[PDB]
Scaffold this active site. Structure first.
Site, mmCIF file in Angstrom:
data_model
loop_
_atom_site.group_PDB
_atom_site.id
_atom_site.type_symbol
_atom_site.label_atom_id
_atom_site.label_comp_id
_atom_site.label_asym_id
_atom_site.label_seq_id
_atom_site.Cartn_x
_atom_site.Cartn_y
_atom_site.Cartn_z
ATOM 1 N N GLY A 28 0.750 -1.257 0.000
ATOM 2 C CA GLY A 28 0.000 0.000 0.000
ATOM 3 C C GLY A 28 0.776 1.302 0.000
ATOM 4 O O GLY A 28 0.191 2.374 0.117
ATOM 5 N N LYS A 59 -0.302 2.703 -4.286
ATOM 6 C CA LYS A 59 -0.733 4.095 -4.535
ATOM 7 C C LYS A 59 -0.312 4.660 -5.882
ATOM 8 O O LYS A 59 -1.010 5.524 -6.413
ATOM 9 C CB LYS A 59 -0.232 5.068 -3.444
ATOM 10 C CG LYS A 59 -0.586 4.697 -2.035
ATOM 11 C CD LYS A 59 -1.881 5.301 -1.550
ATOM 12 C CE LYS A 59 -2.421 4.485 -0.395
ATOM 13 N NZ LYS A 59 -1.547 4.587 0.808
ATOM 14 N N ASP A 73 -9.005 6.990 2.123
ATOM 15 C CA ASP A 73 -8.019 7.723 2.898
ATOM 16 C C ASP A 73 -7.256 8.777 2.048
ATOM 17 O O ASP A 73 -7.297 8.736 0.814
ATOM 18 C CB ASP A 73 -7.019 6.705 3.449
ATOM 19 C CG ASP A 73 -6.191 6.049 2.358
ATOM 20 O OD1 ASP A 73 -6.703 5.101 1.707
ATOM 21 O OD2 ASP A 73 -5.032 6.477 2.152
ATOM 22 N N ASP A 74 -6.533 9.693 2.743
ATOM 23 C CA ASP A 74 -5.670 10.783 2.245
ATOM 24 C C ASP A 74 -6.367 11.684 1.175
ATOM 25 O O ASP A 74 -5.730 12.194 0.239
ATOM 26 C CB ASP A 74 -4.304 10.216 1.780
ATOM 27 C CG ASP A 74 -3.486 9.561 2.905
ATOM 28 O OD1 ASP A 74 -3.549 10.062 4.070
ATOM 29 O OD2 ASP A 74 -2.772 8.549 2.624
ATOM 30 N N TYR A 76 -8.772 6.996 9.506
ATOM 31 C CA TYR A 76 -8.231 5.633 9.674
ATOM 32 C C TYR A 76 -7.293 5.403 10.866
ATOM 33 O O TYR A 76 -6.906 4.255 11.123
ATOM 34 C CB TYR A 76 -7.541 5.160 8.387
ATOM 35 C CG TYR A 76 -6.382 6.003 7.897
ATOM 36 C CD1 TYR A 76 -5.093 5.807 8.388
ATOM 37 C CD2 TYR A 76 -6.553 6.928 6.879
ATOM 38 C CE1 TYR A 76 -4.013 6.550 7.912
ATOM 39 C CE2 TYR A 76 -5.480 7.667 6.383
ATOM 40 C CZ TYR A 76 -4.209 7.470 6.896
ATOM 41 O OH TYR A 76 -3.155 8.198 6.389
ATOM 42 N N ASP A 127 8.088 4.761 2.971
ATOM 43 C CA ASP A 127 7.857 5.627 1.803
ATOM 44 C C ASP A 127 7.875 7.108 2.156
ATOM 45 O O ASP A 127 8.102 7.936 1.269
ATOM 46 C CB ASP A 127 6.546 5.267 1.097
ATOM 47 C CG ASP A 127 5.308 5.298 1.968
ATOM 48 O OD1 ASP A 127 5.442 5.543 3.186
ATOM 49 O OD2 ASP A 127 4.200 5.077 1.431
#
Lengths: 307, 109, 114, 307
Positions: free
Chosen positions: A9, A40, A116-117, A159, A225
């Site tokens: 992820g 992503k 998310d994000d 989350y 990351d």
């Protein structure tokens, strides 16, 4: 009962098919059982989610799902439509239905929707009394369209503890998610913070109360990351074995560099096996799990493998 | 050797915690930095850290000669960045954004 | 279209120079930001509605580009287009008005001069 | 004989073989002739320069050189031993010969030695008079060993005015290079700075007088490895056509992303062709070359190509 494995992820260069097949072999070997496809930077997953696969792409996804099944591994295919989907648009739902239909023709049974994000757009403000509602409405329509798959996951915008507005227990969004979201759909959770130092047993019982269910952990403990100069070869640490009878799963988002995840996935397996049969640290020490992982790892370094 | 991967795992440990071997070097180095009979201590401690700095290069180079290039090629970039820094730490002891940026810089943030 | 590429090139031009269309938009936004009494409110909203028309052209071009037949060219540079698409939303919408880095190496670097 | 083409000599993910072959197709089509293989992050070029090739890598490198030869493109192979070579050591020099021997067994006839972003060690102090002598000596020994290749390149440490200590015309380092480096070996120059805004005729006359030869320009004008948010789709600009009769070649080091480099290579081909037959900007307009490059590029976007 328990979904334990790896989640690809991270932001950055996604793993190749050769690495993914090899990962399934390691997962089966270490008695782990799940894999979540969430890169992503694979445009077909996030940025260009509306885009359908081509003959060639379809062929390797078919090989990968075939490989996944061969190693008794649950391949979960995720999609992140959240950055620009119009939740109320019947064309946007039809696109998500066509895209996930093509993937089910590849051999996929288990799916996931990530939110998310990711402010609401006028059109969705009419139709939807909130974001949580808009995301849940689309998630539930897809889950039912896909014939209620056994394994279906949902990732909330909030989350981790830190992302809940105002707080976790009082969050109207999580309340809405737990209330209105179908009981057959799982909810992902990364603990108190994105990269949780510890995941207290009190922390997740508090979440299970608002989402009205036991969540699946999306652990970013070995995720690297977010910083070019950092690598995490340490042991699985901060999450008590008491947490297993309280969760529906744990999926670790590890280092971008595939070969550096040996200890990351090794120690997790040791952690899951030390208390897979429980009651809703005594059983596991990261120090001892680390020694066992490096001992198995060491032999691999001496085996010739050319780049 | 096992003691090598134990050292390797200690320098690239966890997000909120460095491993023991890594934590020791930093602590011992933070000590040498803060010091100028009692000279014999700093001298012996500077010489023993210098040996520590020399063993870690030895592990770093040993790793670079591994049969498994597939593992090595994935993480040696990190190893090469801490080796560059281990050397000058020892030598110290011995001693824009484009048009998008142009626009985002004129926006409230 | 050709005029679509001309604009695209002008947004990602050279290291010491932006393209004509790129420099034009930048010059105007700088101006809009820097501007009953006087009737110069007439020129501000005329010039602000013209700019919200230019923010709408550039973004129509971006969606168009993403629908190209050549996915190989697109997959190589769209990450850059996606960023300027976000920064022109908040530009238009404006006008309409880790943390302990580097790891062990970095920690050791903080105790070093240079 | 003028060397005009592309140098893949940037930091980042190196190009794949598929892309490198298509590049040879583009270079030939646009009447360009050279390709310099120098990926900074290809471990067997910089970092792991001592490491020999495996069968699979030899097989790949063989097919690529075959492809260059097939498209009338000169394949120049680069190697950067600079970060850790010991110049006085006969084991290091023997290693540099073994690898370039293995590389010439793959059909490579042209080579390069880069000593650019590289402080002398005790043994090279005993043996070598200066830094410039160390490189020059190892470069001349290798060139002669390799049977004096028609195309042999050398990248100095001081590859631009800005890197020259004290200045270009009075640099003791360049003085040694121009004097002691064999006349059949070529010298790479990036212009006044690393990414030169312009490359004046006068600036090149000055360098040529100290290095005692016309240089090959390593152009960083379209290079985008120094900023993650920057891309360069503009035209080759700031280098007069008056420069062609004053250089041995021009090798552009372009954007990291292969497909963005259409305009960078197209406009460079137009600039070269506009004054391919030198004398000792009237003949070239970056504005015009860009009009043509985009018109030609626009047809590529309409051609179906799956990822």
């Amino acid at each position: 009962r328990f979904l334990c494995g790896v989640v690809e992820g991270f932001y950055g260069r996604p793993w190749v098919m050769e690495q993914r097949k090899e990962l399934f072999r390691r997962l089966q070997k270490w008695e782990l059982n799940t894999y979540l496809y969430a890169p992503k930077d694979d445009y077909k997953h996030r940025m260009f989610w509306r885009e359908m696969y081509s003959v060639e792409e379809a062929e390797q996804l078919m090989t990968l799902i075939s490989a996944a099944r061969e190693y008794e591994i649950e391949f979960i295919y995720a999609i992140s439509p959240g950055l620009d989907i119009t939740f109320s648009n019947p064309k946007e739902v039809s696109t998500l239905k066509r895209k996930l239909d093509q993937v089910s023709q590849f051999g996929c049974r288990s799916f996931a929707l990530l939110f998310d994000d990711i402010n609401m757009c006028a059109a969705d403000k009419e139709v939807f009394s909130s974001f949580a509602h808009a995301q849940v409405s689309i998630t539930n329509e897809i889950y039912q369209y896909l014939g209620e798959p056994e394994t279906f996951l949902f990732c909330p915008t909030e989350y981790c503890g830190t992302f809940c507005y105002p707080n976790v227990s009082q969050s109207p969004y999580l309340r809405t998610v737990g209330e209105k979201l179908l009981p057959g759909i799982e909810v992902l959770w990364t603990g108190p913070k994105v990269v949780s130092k510890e995941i207290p047993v009190e922390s997740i019982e508090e979440v299970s109360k608002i989402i009205k269910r036991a969540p699946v952990i999306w652990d970013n403990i070995h995720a690297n990351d977010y910083d070019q100069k950092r690598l995490f070869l340490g042991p699985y640490k901060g999450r008590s074995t008491e947490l297993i009878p309280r969760l529906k799963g744990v999926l670790t988002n590890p280092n971008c560099e595939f070969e550096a995840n040996y200890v990351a996935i090794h120690t997790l397996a040791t952690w899951y096996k030390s208390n897979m049969n429980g009651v809703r640290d005594v059983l596991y020490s990261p120090q001892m799990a680390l020694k066992l992982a490096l001992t198995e790892w060491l032999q691999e370094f001496g085996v010739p493998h050319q780049y | 050797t096992l003691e090598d991967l134990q050292l390797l795992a200690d320098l690239f440990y966890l997000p909120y915690e460095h491993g023991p071997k890594g934590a020791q070097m930093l602590r011992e180095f933070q000590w040498l930095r803060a010091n100028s009979e009692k000279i014999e201590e700093w001298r012996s401690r500077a010489a023993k850290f210098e040996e520590m700095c020399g063993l870690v290069m030895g592990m770093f180079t040993r790793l670079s000669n591994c049969a498994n290039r597939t593992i090595l090629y994935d993480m040696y970039s990190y190893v090469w960045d801490i080796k560059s820094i281990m050397s000058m730490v020892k030598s110290f002891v011995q001693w824009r954004g484009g048009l998008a940026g142009e626009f985002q810089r004129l926006l409230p943030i």
